[PDB]
Write a protein that binds this ligand. Structure first.
Ligand SMILES: O=S(=O)(c1ccc(O)cc1O)N1Cc2cc(O)cc(O)c2C1
Ligand SMILES: O=S(=O)(c1ccc(O)cc1O)N1Cc2cc(O)cc(O)c2C1
Lengths: 363, 363
């Protein structure tokens, strides 16, 4: 009873995704009136977001698109879009519509659970089948950043709806904590990373945390954020910092600690993790965020989580000494706005590159 | 007796500049035989470098190219190219050729002494005459990085020739010190910056230096480098770090020191300058390297000096606390290779951009 998927994809890809702020997410209520509004919003917005990214998948090199794992992920997106199309003519006033809608979103979330490693298998299939080439590699890098950020945003919308309209912390709004204690999340991530480090190395660096609350020196630092995302970033950073520290100190019984500073400024909430794990030459930094070289998407996905609400995650090393990693977040919920890729001329132009000599000299 | 400048520009712009390594610069001798070789090399290479960048000047927006200061700089480049064309048919075996050539290079260097602020006046003329627009601004940013790096490389070639073939430190090869003591340059830059800070604020932060020589912990860190370039970068960084520190501490008599770490690894020699000057939000970092917003090209030019021998200069702040600046240099003279822009299809494509919506969403 549905139209062919391409007809829906073309229709919805004409719209731009609509970025929401953390404050907008937070201010959304839980009444039946609010549930109807979420329904009518999401039966438009989710198809817009699904269609936009599906259109970019089609711009990938034939080589990457031809891989079975990429085709598999594509087929999931198609079915998920069609699942939502079933709701276009349904009455929001009917309670069964709303309950059925929530069930459909859960089914979609589950269907897409393994998207990240499935796409990674696609990248490997491309490399194995054809060998890699720099042009395709740049396109893959550009696309995957956008694809995975898209996915993060779709999961955010779905989680907010299912959590609110279907508990450990009742004070949270869906997955959002209006009073996230940053140092507590740092400690939780450290604890879990230490378990792993201790298992493999029988030792781990200690943690030291310092807070700089610029405007209110005595006050513990809190923010509006999704604690699971913050935890994810910190856990990945701790794993890298711990491994560097232990491996660079094979001979020592004394390990330098990992030092974390949490700073709260007027605009930024910044978290720096400093290790003395011997560092890495500058030349090798970019590789850490590469889907190719690391095909372990922990660091690039962590940086996407940071970028998702207008933040960033940056690494600066001193070879021979150690490495600083900094998570930059927006301090204010009103500045914390979804960063969403959009399918348009500008996007389309990025996949329209070819092999040639660079604009810089080689000997 | 010369052809029209465009005929020479077209001829020489077909070649790519030839990047030399620090080791190649260093290994060049001072005999009459070596002077002839430098002559025959430079009467080709300097025209290639002049022509390549002149071709890119022509790709600038009409608006920027139409400014009197940009046209003035263009006219200097034309005359300098023609000055060298006078030497195409001259005999390297004739001592007068060589002496005349050195005189011509000195005249060129002097002619171009004020290129940096003259171009900056061009940018201001563009802004005043037309108002600025984002497309032109991006083109200006791209071009100026390349133009000023080009200029650095041309001045390097000229200085090496005139210094070698026409002293405080006789151990230097032209402007290159094969045994540059990095901490000594840090101290020299600090001393000069402190003079300025003390003049205006009647106080300045102290300096602390720590060295990490990974492979040889006891040994003072030395490298092959051009000390004036290193001094330039450190002086600019100290001025910023000092101003931040004093201005963020208006009420205090105790100023936090500026801490410098010099680390020597297998591949990198890294110099970190850390201040507690209160920092800056991430949003405002990019502006520091902008020719537009800072129209004070101290930071962007400093970063070009770092990039010139395959290094970099990076800033990471923690708003509410302070800022780290890191100069990344190649530890090895063989890795220290000129980074030279080249005029080709790839370069040409960058000026072929236009106004449109970005590939990312706006609310
Ligand atoms: O690149 S690192 O500087 C680094 C990268 C990311 C990060 O968040 C922290 C880091 O120290 N590091 C050095 C090293 C040495 C090892 O022996 C094993 C490692 O996993 C590593 C990792
Ligand atoms: O951007 S900063 O963090 C900075 C930029 C570059 C650098 O090398 C060091 C820095 O601290 N800094 C803060 C601030 C406050 C002032 O009142 C005056 C200043 O000049 C500044 C400069």
């Amino acid at each position: 009873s549905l139209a062919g998927a391409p007809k829906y994809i073309e229709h919805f890809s004409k719209f731009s995704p609509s970025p929401l702020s953390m404050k907008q997410f937070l201010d959304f209520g839980s009444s039946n009136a609010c549930e109807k509004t979420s329904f009518t919003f999401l039966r438009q917005e989710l198809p817009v977001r699904l269609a936009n990214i599906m259109k970019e998948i089609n711009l990938l090199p034939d080589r990457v698109l031809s891989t079975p794992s990429v085709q598999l992920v594509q087929s999931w997106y198609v079915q998920s879009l069609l699942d939502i199309m079933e709701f276009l003519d349904k009455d929001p006033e009917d309670h069964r519509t709303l309950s059925q809608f929530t069930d459909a979103l859960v089914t979609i979330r589950n269907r897409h659970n393994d998207v990240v490693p499935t796409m990674a298998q696609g990248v490997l299939e491309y490399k194995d089948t054809y060998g890699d080439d720099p042009v395709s590699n740049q396109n893959i890098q550009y696309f995957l950043d956008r694809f995975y950020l898209s996915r993060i945003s779709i999961r955010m919308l779905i989680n907010q709806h299912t959590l609110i309209f279907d508990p450990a912390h009742p004070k949270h709004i869906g997955s959002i904590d209006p009073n996230c204690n940053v140092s507590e999340v740092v400690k939780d991530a450290y604890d879990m990373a230490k378990l792993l480090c201790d298992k493999y190395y029988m030792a781990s660096p200690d943690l030291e945390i310092q807070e700089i609350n610029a405007a209110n020196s005595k006050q513990p630092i809190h923010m509006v954020y999704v604690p699971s995302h913050l935890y994810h970033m910190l856990f990945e950073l701790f794993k890298n910092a711990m491994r560097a520290t232990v491996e660079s100190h094979e001979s020592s019984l004394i390990l330098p600690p990992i030092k974390v500073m949490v700073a709260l400024g007027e605009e930024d909430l910044s978290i720096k993790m400093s290790d003395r794990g011997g560092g890495v030459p500058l030349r090798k930094i970019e590789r850490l965020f590469s889907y190719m070289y690391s095909t372990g998407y922990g660091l690039p996905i962590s940086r996407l989580y940071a970028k998702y609400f207008q933040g960033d995650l940056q690494l600066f090393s001193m070879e021979g000494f150690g490495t600083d990693a900094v998570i930059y977040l927006k301090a204010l919920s009103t500045d914390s706005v979804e960063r969403l890729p959009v399918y348009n001329k500008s996007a389309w132009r990025h996949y329209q590159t070819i092999q040639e000599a660079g604009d810089w000299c080689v000997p």
